[PDB]
């Protein structure tokens, strides 16, 4: 039945993957409100769709900055994948378009803010609170990996909390459809699997290692490998010596030792039983997988919302005005967008 759900999900994905939606809106249909978060190529802004009165989160990418940073293929991967996927824990892409200067991805607005903000403020999540979030990541990865997709950017910063206290995965800038091994050095220092640091060819198992880092960070309040400089973080990861807080349950530690396994022949998610080694682990015994997918499990935390268009669950960012050049930039590089 999971097999049946997945096969049908694949048929749906493939049709959109092979025939992508393109130029489904225009910049002047949206009222720009405030910056929700930033990046190397632009920003993610709270916008209002005038025709419907709906609020959205619009990702703006400067084509020239994308080209300079050699992120062309990664950008085309992000939009092509996002428009083709459909899962309760994946942010919906409502519209995409481009102009002379920029690329635009209009997504569902997630008002609850980043998991990152709530985790840093509160300090750490209890094991049932962490388990609730981890279960949603486990299902999301089971879905993505079945479609030959590697996510490659798991971290609390990319996990948004909706009105129901459920996760919405955002930022697909490193997502890639790959049947075999891949080599691009990308991700976040704290979340990188040793295979990535060691310039080896790697596969989906890097997402399962990143899941180990996420579960550890949510339950400890800090990641398993941290230092002031990324080179020092990399030395810690490749040794893979993990120390656990005294408050971590024996089951939590056992799950984490299997997830933060430097040996790929031993890493959970990577074995012959695949995701089932994770889903059947003792730490997940109380998890009802179907109820998680159906959103019927009550969330341990429901964010505050002072109506539609409120941004208080997000930090404030310096505003930069959108300038659209008279001349088309990087036309050929982004023709398929």
């Amino acid at each position: 039945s999971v097999k049946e759900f997945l096969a049908k999900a694949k048929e749906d994905f493939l049709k959109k993957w092979e025939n992508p939606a393109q130029n489904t809106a225009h910049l002047d249909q949206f009222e720009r409100i405030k910056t929700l978060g930033t990046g190397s190529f632009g920003r993610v802004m709270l916008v209002k769709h005038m025709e419907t009165g709906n609020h959205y989160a619009m990702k703006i990418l400067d084509k020239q900055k994308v080209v300079k940073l050699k992120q062309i293929e990664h950008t085309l991967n992000e939009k092509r994948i996002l428009q083709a996927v459909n899962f309760p824990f994946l942010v919906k892409l409502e519209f995409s378009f481009k102009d002379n200067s920029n690329l635009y991805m209009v997504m569902e607005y997630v008002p609850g803010g980043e998991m990152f903000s709530h985790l840093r403020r509160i300090g750490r999540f209890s094991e049932p609170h962490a388990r609730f979030y981890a279960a949603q990541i486990v299902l999301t990865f089971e879905y993505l990996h079945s479609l030959d997709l590697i996510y490659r950017d798991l971290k609390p910063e990319n996990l948004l909390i909706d009105q129901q206290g459920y996760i919405q995965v955002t930022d697909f800038g490193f997502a890639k459809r790959v049947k075999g091994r891949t080599w691009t050095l990308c991700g976040t220092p704290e979340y990188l699997a040793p295979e990535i640091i060691l310039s080896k060819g790697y596969n989906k198992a890097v997402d399962w290692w990143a899941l180990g880092v996420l579960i550890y960070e949510m339950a400890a309040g800090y990641p398993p490998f941290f230092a002031d400089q990324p080179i020092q973080i990399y030395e810690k990861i490749v040794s893979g010596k993990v120390r656990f807080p005294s408050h971590f349950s024996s089951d939590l530690k056992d799950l984490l030792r299997n997830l933060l396994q430097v040996d790929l022949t031993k890493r959970f998610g990577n074995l012959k039983d695949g995701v089932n080694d994770i889903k059947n682990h003792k730490w997940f015994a109380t998890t009802d997988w179907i109820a998680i997918y159906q959103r019927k499990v009550e969330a341990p935390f429901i964010p505050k919302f002072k109506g539609p268009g409120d941004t208080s669950n997000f930090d404030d960012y310096e505003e930069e005005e959108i300038r659209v050049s008279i001349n088309e930039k990087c036309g050929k590089e982004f023709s398929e967008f």
Partner: peptide
């Protein structure tokens, strides 16, 4: 404590992605 070492580190804010 590990918490005090983390809190005093320069890596408690939003972490940037790395590439190429």
């Amino acid at each position: 404590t590990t918490y005090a070492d983390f809190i005093a580190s320069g890596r408690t804010g939003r972490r940037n992605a790395i590439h190429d």
